[PDB]
Enzyme design. Structure first.
Site: not given
Lengths: 461, 465, 463, 463
Positions: D97-98, D131, D186-187, D317, D323-324, D330
């Site tokens: 319930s916190g 209270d 497509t596919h 890398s 490499k980029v 991601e």
């Protein structure tokens, strides 16, 4: 026993009596996955409406002769009237665009049109499955259109009315039980009073919020892809086809379909299915909680909670004689568990589009229609066989109410939290009543206790 | 407020906070991935990297491709990371590149610059230890980050999770023995059923964790396999012959755990199937723990207007408003952890399907979710054992009342009078508010002698006598 | 067209020609949820085995007359021979213990036995559904026993052999393609070489690990609840029944079933179903990745990657003439998505037992059997119609291999990362070869470059 | 060092300089689960708002003296101004319930108020935690109130603006690239043309739909439980409290909060959190697809598709020099995978309420806030560091467009599906072009082929 049909890949032997042709037969043989003919009949019905609509729109826009429209229309009417169910043998687990079921429609309509026109099966049809039945179409816009017709139809005709019927029963029970004072439980532990009607008012509110959440999703769901053809551009459609074919679908189904605002979104995603299914899943989690509460409240009849009486519909045990179980609650909780897993499947599939096409269409359609149908069916069953006949077990309610030590909460504004805690803790340790210890601890007079601790005054108003 | 210095990478110059031991690529990542709280990459992954980078230096020196003087400085910097002296040198988040390149380079840059300074140099000078050629010699992010994931995952499961589940399993089995003679009423469908001992009920909980422990242990042979030696795509390009087995020997030595090289380096880069496998066993255990915790709070419910068959330790006030209320709060923590583990299982499973070609690029999110499940299950099993399970006692009078009240004690009559006549007795007792024995006799269906002979709760907890 | 049958709650009108009775007919009417008769036929078959075993064990232990055993056995044999499939009309979405399907078995066996013995359907059977057919049993131990028999049978007879078949093809392809040098891709970007065989070795290893993971879960799954009766205590069983009935089920099925070590765990949970389904879901996530790679590698045929040829089995489009799609890949990815959702359902249901009983049994059973069946069917289909026919596109592979500027990685141990990055960036800017720029900048000689930057020597360790 | 504080259960050693007291310290020691202080700071902030609102409402309704309101408000202002962050040590994984976090607020406000008023920490406070600071309240209505304040604030101030920012970039790119013709897939197979702008228009539409879907959930989320107290009845609240306290929360936050229509729904469920999270999860599955497409489109430079150029922000890398990688893509796909799991957890927990209270509040709150924040952060990151900088790779687009054999689809309405298929299949078999085979087969004249097979005429309806 077989006849020869052809597609662009060659000759296929097709069961001689069936209206389908080469591509249907390839799919039937090449996807032996799950039970036969598992593609939902609701998708076939939706195809009947949209293939009829396409023929009608093509004729109005001057690219299909009326005589071909009328033959296509007649074959579609037969599909819709449940005369050609044995002509659709393909599975869910086919190509992910539903090309093969699209070509099942095109082939069956072409061959059946030939026979309607006075021809024989095994002859070249007067209607070409690609050039005529599929004119201005792709699998890529037809299958999504079938998915939204079938989905929207099921939600508005089956799921919403079933949830509304149960919601109205729960609201009626909230009014029926508005003067039944019972003990609240929080953390499963004894709490302060509420009326059984208040408790039921929470269940009724849950379904009212759920209904609103489902209805919020209908404007996206009524949007149809038809007209986007191969990649969303409307290549090979006549100008105005998208709006005109949506208008025919709306007329034939009696439902408020419109052309999709963005045909790239309508082909490359099933986001509207994700959206609506999320709201079905919200309702299912609410129904789980409602059903679970009703079986907890009904538990017993002697060694549980036992605050409510439910209809006793069938023997509950093969061995325990005279046992009766909250079996409608169990069906509801199981349907809810199925809807959550269906939401995982639909959400995962809905992330997996590539470029111009989401190729998870049949698995998203079958899971969606299962959730929509099972929620509708279990809400009707639960309403009929459980919720409408719930009644209080009044003597048990009264005992459990008067027994709670947390009735001491009524004393907070008179003696303060710490003093009230000492009363309840002392009664708990000694096995005594709150009143006995308020007096013995010198914290509340017998007379003030009796004025200040009244369960009927602790339920608001 | 920051002072800076210039570091460079192949893309250009970067301003780096002047006193930090990281360099251009760490600082790019720190600025380009402002996603969630800073420095979220789990410390267990940084620790795992400390072990594997030191191992790589020892292996490379043994295989003749790294001078011992460089191995020694790399090891000194790795030992500072492992001693938790450099925690503020790792600022990068989970939500970075999905291979963990940026954290790999965070290790390479910090080790290179800290080595240079240990050796008597100044930050700002080009290190005598090159981040790529020396610290990262014979390595990629693509084999180091999976290696770090398996070192961290295996260590947490064997050092924390399994011992914690074993501790709770032993308490549940001890309580099953303690309560072996306490006869209570079973409930099926939440409805009154036939007797079982409180011991028998706790024996089920103990068996569930024994099964779950076997299920986790069955997954360790795949988890102990390390990717290190696969380099860029799995082929071991630019590794000395023998490096894969040698570097696993050094990781096993430094960690004290039985790591081995992976059987198939393509599987070890292109997938995190071992993480999917072991997390499914954690999730099995979590679903068992949910049920155990939920039963214990149902059994403890009340104390006056619920079930109330057991007494549990009263650790804190339950309410800010209901004075003297006490809740089954350890049970709630365990159910909430279990709900978290199931969602982590969805995340891991989804991510585990999403590899492309030679690399799965969901590594940090799989790692972070795995380590959260393993840690939370360990912590909550210890907490639940200490603060709940060890203190459970029967509420004897309340048990006896609920036992004697069940109409389904009538089931003991089945083999003597048949199901239908037994159902008549229970249905009539139910309708009239009476006892089974008085309706069996009222209806003339059983003699007093046979009713008392055949209806004995203590005989109903086993096979026919 | 109805006859009157009774249970302890009163009279029920039953279709006059059906072998079921009052409790089956109540369920059939009270649970109008989904299509009719959705309870998996595998669960009914498993019930045929265990009901026959229970009757045989009860006679051996002196509590059931042989005459009644024989009639029960004959009716069970008819169920197992699929002669009574129209006598099981009930849905998954019934009571969560499967009481109503248990009573469907008990009523159909009782009435069929009566008719076999020469009686008329509609007369009170010689065989009582509760006292005889259900002797020494509950729904609570029979339904979990049916679940484990059906689950174990499907995994070991269908799922495992199918996955083994596809694993064997992927391993064969790893050997067939061992000398095909292709470009790696990491983050979807050009990387360093590997053989097409090595790439397929990864797939084969994934399925090998997944098979081990499933097999690890079978010891728990073959444990049977039968003998626990109502709450796990074995109330109303003869001494020895638990072991004897498991021995009969093992003999009838030919599968190594044993009595469950703990009957409370066996009733109050379906943790074995969660365990085994987790392993099926692991295999499914591996299959998704394998199928997705194969469609990416086959993409094109001219405007994609196009490194492999796959069987072309059917037209791909109704509108794009001559298009052909990786349709078997798509079926496998859709089945994988289904298995993940089934794992959510099973895991959620598995948490939700109360006290002595988990009452999510039919939903756990149906999801489990769907995953085990669809994984079997789609692995067989994929193997037959895709994996066996995969071949390299030899000239496309060579074009994409020779094009990667990350072949420069072969120079790192000769000239260092920074000098290699210079050769790569110089070739890229100038649109020249790595070889031309390595010689141009005098970082490597022609003869050294042609010995050091050889794709075929980049698919293993140094030496 | 320590000081003794007391609650109704006994004496507790509390860290001597901390403003919390016995119940916070019990929780800190009894729930050693995950890292310290994991309860989200947005919940603590929402508590500062609602505790100040409750004191103001209580004074207006004559049950709290103004002098105590003013001290409570001063302490709540310090919490809101982030001056007391080190006073909140509790975890998510506490009571469901916190309660313990509610009492953390009550104890810290009571003790800080005493010190502000000139007292000494460790004396009995002039303000009582139960209270006074908790007057007219429960954990059971305060914690759901904190949840909805935090959730609503984060969605409308962070998540919606971030998604809107990316949607507008994708819409601007749809317009920028409206005349760039590229090949559809497509596919994953070569299809017919669409503009790069059309393709982006799909991404922009996905985020517009998702924004609408989030905003549809806001009416339920703006409802606050405050006033329901222990079970929903509003026991121990003065007449008018529920509306007045909502009015103070709306004033202090500047957000359109109202009292909940049904306090039983507002305590016994977190159905509004399930509703809004489902919409976050819908947006997350769209973002997954958008980010995945952008990395497929950027894939290469030579081995992939390479139709778009994306900003190059960092080395990709440690080993492959130069490499980029599409790293922003991601991060977005990983966040999306997190949000789906978060939806499983929230949905599961949302089902698990019992009677008057759902006691999964902290786990639902933390997963919700993580989804909302990570979606916001990754949309801003992806917008700044990727989407704003996308450009076409013109010649690559042109090569891949011209190469597609499914340009033949332009001929369907001139020669029919079958004749168009013959042209594409023959080009495929012979390794020739559509134009060569249209002419060699005698199906289309060179002049007609050139007039009909024009990609710029294939991105809309027939003329």
């Amino acid at each position: 026993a077989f006849r020869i049909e052809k597609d662009t890949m060659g000759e296929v032997q097709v069961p001689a009596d069936k209206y389908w042709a080469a591509q249907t037969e390839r799919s039937r043989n090449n996807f032996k996955i799950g039970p036969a003919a598992s593609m939902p009949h609701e998708i076939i019905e939706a195809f009947g409406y949209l293939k009829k609509a396409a023929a009608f729109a093509n004729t109005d826009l001057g690219v299909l002769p009326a005589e071909k429209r009328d033959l296509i229309g007649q074959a579609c009417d037969e599909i819709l009237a449940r005369k050609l169910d044995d002509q659709f043998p393909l599975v869910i687990w086919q190509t992910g665009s539903g090309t093969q079921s699209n070509m099942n429609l095109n082939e069956v309509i072409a061959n059946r049109a030939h026979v309607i026109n006075g021809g024989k099966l095994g002859e070249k049809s007067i209607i070409h499955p690609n050039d005529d039945v599929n004119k201005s179409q792709s699998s890529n816009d037809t299958y999504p259109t079938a998915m939204h017709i079938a989905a929207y139809k099921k939600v508005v005709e089956a799921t919403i009315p079933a949830v509304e019927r149960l919601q109205k029963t729960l609201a009626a029970k909230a009014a029926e039980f508005k003067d039944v004072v019972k003990i609240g439980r929080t953390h499963l532990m004894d709490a302060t009073p509420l009326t059984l009607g208040q408790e039921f008012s929470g269940y009724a509110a849950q379904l009212s919020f759920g209904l609103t959440a489902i209805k919020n999703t209908l404007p996206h769901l009524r949007q149809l892809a038809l007209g986007g053809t191969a990649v969303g551009t409307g290549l090979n459609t006549p100008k105005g086809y998208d709006v005109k074919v949506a208008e025919y679908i709306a007329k034939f189904t009696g439902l408020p379909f419109i052309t999709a605002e963005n045909k790239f979104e309508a082909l490359a995603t099933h986001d509207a299915i994700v959206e609506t299914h999320g709201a079905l899943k919200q309702v299912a989690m609410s129904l789980f909680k409602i059903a679970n509460d009703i079986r907890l409240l009904a538990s017993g009849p002697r060694s549980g909670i036992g605050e409510i009486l439910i209809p006793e519909n069938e023997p509950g045990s093969s061995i325990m004689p005279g046992k009766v179980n909250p079996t409608q609650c169990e069906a509801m909780t199981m349907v809810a568990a199925q809807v959550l897993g269906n939401d995982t499947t639909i959400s995962f599939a809905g992330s997996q589009g590539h470029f111009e096409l989401n190729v998870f269409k049949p698995v998203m359609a079958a899971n969606f229609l299962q959730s929509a149908q099972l929620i509708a069916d279990v809400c009707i069953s639960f309403d009929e066989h459980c919720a409408t006949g719930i009644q209080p077990n009044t003597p048990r309610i009264q005992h459990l109410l008067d027994s709670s030590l947390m009735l001491v909460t009524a004393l907070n504004t008179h003696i303060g939290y710490e003093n009230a805690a000492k009363i309840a803790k002392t009664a708990h340790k000694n096995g005594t009543t709150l009143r006995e210890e308020a007096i013995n601890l010198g914290l509340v007079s017998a007379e003030d206790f009796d004025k200040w601790v009244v369960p009927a005054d602790m339920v608001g108003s």
